[PDB]
Amino acid sequence: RQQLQVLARYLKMDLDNGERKFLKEKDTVAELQAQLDYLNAELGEFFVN
Amino acid sequence: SAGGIRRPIQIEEFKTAISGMSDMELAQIKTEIENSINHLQRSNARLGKYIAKLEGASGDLALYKDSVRENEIVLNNYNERVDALEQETVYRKTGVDMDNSNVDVVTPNSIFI
């Protein structure tokens, strides 16, 4: 674990870069879903379909 | 040029005359006065030596003293005249509403009719 860590540091390689971008997008998922859930409520399920 | 003529001139008459001149004429007068300043400062350097030589030792000492006192009166006119040159220079670098408050469309007339 530690031996890996120092090599990652040497390579200027960011291990967690992926998950950071992943956490970011799921926040925008919830955001768009919230906007979608709203219009479904304001129009009714039948209207949208 | 009539400005910076090695003798002290009145300032208010210079401060008007400087206004109606060309920019190359102001640079010629500015060059002429600075040469006049260096002429008195190299003169006051020579008067400074004849003070310090005799001060080391009272006739022919007050006559040196009012000679360098007089040059400061003429030099006071020069840098005052140079101050007017500076002030003339810096003057030449300027020259949805669902409330029916707007259109009252509860009424048939308000739309455009």
Add this chain to the structure above:
Amino acid sequence: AKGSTLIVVPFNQGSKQDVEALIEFIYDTEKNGGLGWDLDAIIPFAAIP
């Protein structure tokens, strides 16, 4: 006048949800955070040019 009251609420006629909530907000009891009223008159004059 005496006995008169006035309530101002921000409101969007366009929104379904706002309509349902507003009518509930009038008729719900003071103890559940409502007005506990019963309307005698409705004047739905709101509209846009």
